[PDB]
Amino acid sequence: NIRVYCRIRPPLPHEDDNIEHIKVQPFDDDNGDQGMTINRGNSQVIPFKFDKIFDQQETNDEIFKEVGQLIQSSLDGYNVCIFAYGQTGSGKTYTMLNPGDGIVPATINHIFSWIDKLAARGWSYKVSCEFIEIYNENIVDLLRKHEIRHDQELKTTYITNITTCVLDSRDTVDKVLKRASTAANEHSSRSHSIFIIHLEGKNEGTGEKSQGILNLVDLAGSERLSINKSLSCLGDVIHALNSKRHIPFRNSKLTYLLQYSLIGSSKTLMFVNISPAALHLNETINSLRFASKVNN
Numbered sequence: 001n002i003r004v005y006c007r008i009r010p011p012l013p014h015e016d017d018n019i020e021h022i023k024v025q026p027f028d029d030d031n032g033d034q035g036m037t038i039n040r041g042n043s044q045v046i047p048f049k050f051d052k053i054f055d056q057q058e059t060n061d062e063i064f065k066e067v068g069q070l071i072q073s074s075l076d077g078y079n080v081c082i083f084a085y086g087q088t089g090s091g092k093t094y095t096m097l098n099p100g101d102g103i104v105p106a107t108i109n110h111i112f113s114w115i116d117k118l119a120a121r122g123w124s125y126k127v128s129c130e131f132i133e134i135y136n137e138n139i140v141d142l143l144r145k146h147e148i149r150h151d152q153e154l155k156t157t158y159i160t161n162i163t164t165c166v167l168d169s170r171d172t173v174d175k176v177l178k179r180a181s182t183a184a185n186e187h188s189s190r191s192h193s194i195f196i197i198h199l200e201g202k203n204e205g206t207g208e209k210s211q212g213i214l215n216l217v218d219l220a221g222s223e224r225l226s227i228n229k230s231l232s233c234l235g236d237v238i239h240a241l242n243s244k245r246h247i248p249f250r251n252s253k254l255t256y257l258l259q260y261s262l263i264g265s266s267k268t269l270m271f272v273n274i275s276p277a278a279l280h281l282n283e284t285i286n287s288l289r290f291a292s293k294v295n296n
């Protein structure tokens with residue numbers, strides 16, 4: 001299962017708040033989809049359809065209501081990927097990492113709720129995480145040679161010398177996230193940011209085990225400037241997973257790292273973040289056309 005949401009951020013103060021060129025239709029019930037058009041100027045109107053479209057008023061909290069169900073998969077042993085795609089400036093970091101509100105803090109919080117509750121059935125759970133950044137195919141550890149190693153048999157993935165932080169408490173979580181320059185911003189906007197949560201549960205009373213990975217990914221900006229190569233290769237991978245045939249995971253680090261959370265029963269959701277601004281009509285269109293191939 002692969003789902004695609006689109007999110008339009010509100011206009012910024014230093015920009016022009018004219019959003020006449022984007023129009024979003026109501027959620028089509030009997031076809032499970034939401035449409036939008038973009039008026040390109042010269043009256044050439046381009047249609048798009050996604051699984052859900054979030055307008056400028058929609059908040060991080062509202063957005064999590066429509067993601068929560070996917071997160072709950074990792075308790076049934078599914079692997080999960082949530083990607084944020086779109087141009088630098090469109091709100092990827094804000095969507096994934098906004099304090100308290102973003103997909104990452106919200107996900108972590110949501111998972112604890114379920115852990116608290118499942119303890120009543122004798123499930124006990126270990127939660128650990130890793131937080132990495134990939135730039136020009138170099139892995140940097142944001143909790144500090146880093147090599148990827150897969151275990152064919154157990155279908156698991158390891159990155160060498162990465163600090164894995166054990167999430168023991170809501171206090172322990174809060175420290176890690178509270179912890180999370182001009183050059184630095186340019187740098188991270190050309191990088192993927194991956195937050196990996198591992199969920200391990202055992203239930204002595206039944207004997208049952210469970211594992212779940214959640215990969216919360218904040219991608220390199222999609223505008224044209226290697227970053228280009230890994231975005232295309234992600235596109236090709238996901239589309240081909242949607243269509244039994246051969247998938248070149250190894251063609252880029254990002255897809256090679258995430259391969260076991262993209263094959264099989266794995267569930268994926270992509271956020272296409274778009275800017276509402278006039279100057280960015282073209283980059284918005286590329287983002288939408290990309291999101292369509294990934295979805296269609």
Ligand SMILES: Nc1ncnc2c1ncn2[C@@H]1O[C@H](COP(=O)(O)OP(=O)(O)O)[C@@H](O)[C@H]1O
Pocket residue numbers: 008009010012086087088089090091092093094095189221273
């Ligand atoms: N949904 C939103 N609501 C309010 N402000 C937003 C939203 N999305 C983005 N912003 C603001 O717009 C700017 C760009 O967001 P950011 O997340 O840094 O973009 P990106 O990571 O996609 O390059 C930031 O200043 C951010 O606070």
Ligand SMILES: [Mg+2]
Pocket residue numbers: 092093188189
């Ligand atoms: Mg960013």
